[PDB]
């Protein structure tokens, strides 16, 4: 089932937040970073992945 379907299933089952990640989720963060509201942020790698990046070991 290709690498990507595996990645979606695993994320939705092990990420801190359970909701399905939508393009608009990355879209609204991108909108923010592009607006003056983030005038003080730069050179950063900002994660928008329901927190999966913070985990080390799963559970089940």
């Amino acid at each position: 089932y290709t690498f990507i379907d595996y990645a979606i299933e695993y994320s939705e089952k092990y990420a801190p937040l359970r909701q399905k990640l939508l393009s608009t989720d990355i879209g609204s963060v991108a909108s923010f970073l592009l607006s003056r509201e983030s005038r003080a942020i730069t050179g950063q790698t900002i994660y928008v992945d329901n927190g999966l990046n913070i985990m080390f070991l799963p559970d089940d």
């Binding site: 290709t2 690498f3 990507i4 379907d5 595996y6 990645a7 979606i8 994320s11 990420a15 990640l21 939508l22 393009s23 608009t24 989720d25 990355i26 879209g27 609204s28 963060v29 991108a30 909108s31 970073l33 592009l34 607006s35 003056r36 983030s38 005038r39 942020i41 730069t42 050179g43 950063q44 790698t45 900002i46 994660y47 928008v48 992945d49 329901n50 999966l52 990046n53």
Partner: protein, 229 residues
């Protein structure tokens, strides 16, 4: 009154479209840079309303697309396109598709913009793992996925007002290993992230322009499916 150039849209299923949507919510004009291999097809779909119900926005809003231009991040300037791709079935009818040309075309037609979005990547050997990736393929992943960002900045920085912002997309595989994300794409993402800092220093100090990157979760888009694993 903000204008944003989005590079990396070839259908409404990737992150670009989602970004263009959210940008429209805040009423920013959008220019789509579209890759030639799927340019006409995209135009046709758009024209026949095949994207119509995808430009919808909760607040009744309907995406506002300022322009849709052919664009290939493989070429910095016109003197860069090889004769073959130059006479190729998809590129013949087209013109002004290099980074320099589109940058110029945009400025010439709408003036200075203030938002730049890099939403693309590519690698011929993504299916192969690092160890088995060839120099050719590896350098291809970095040329298309990482260098394009720098070239994109170099040319657009000049048609951008002060305080404008730039963003690109990345994936955590750059920092931790994910088997299956091959072809050197994890390597390209690692370079993009490091370059995002180096560029922030320079663009910051000299133009007062910001640049950040977004490490996204999984999305079933055309590109992603290309992995096949």
């Amino acid at each position: 009154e903000d204008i944003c150039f989005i590079a990396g849209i070839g259908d409404t299923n990737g992150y670009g479209w989602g970004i263009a949507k959210e940008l429209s919510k805040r009423n920013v004009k959008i220019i789509f840079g579209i890759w030639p291999p799927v340019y006409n097809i995209f135009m046709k779909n758009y024209k026949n309303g095949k994207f119509d119900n995808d430009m919808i926005i909760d607040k009744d809003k309907k995406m506002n697309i300022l322009d849709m231009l052919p664009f290939d991040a493989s070429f910095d300037t016109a003197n860069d396109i090889d004769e073959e791709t130059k006479n190729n079935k998809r590129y013949n009818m087209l013109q002004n598709y290099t980074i320099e040309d589109v940058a110029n075309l945009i400025h010439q037609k709408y003036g200075k913009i203030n938002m730049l979005v890099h939403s693309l990547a590519n690698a011929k050997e993504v299916q192969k793992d690092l160890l088995n990736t060839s120099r050719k393929g590896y350098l291809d992943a970095l040329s298309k996925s990482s260098y394009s960002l720098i070239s994109l900045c170099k040319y657009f920085v000049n048609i951008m007002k002060p305080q404008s912002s730039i963003i690109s997309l990345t994936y955590h595989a750059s920092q931790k290993v994910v088997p299956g994300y091959g072809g050197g794409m994890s390597s390209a993402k690692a370079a993009l992230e490091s370059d995002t800092r180096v560029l922030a220093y320079h663009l910051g100090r000299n133009y007062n322009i910001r640049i950040n990157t977004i490490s996204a979760g999984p999305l079933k888009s055309r590109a992603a499916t290309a992995i096949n694993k």
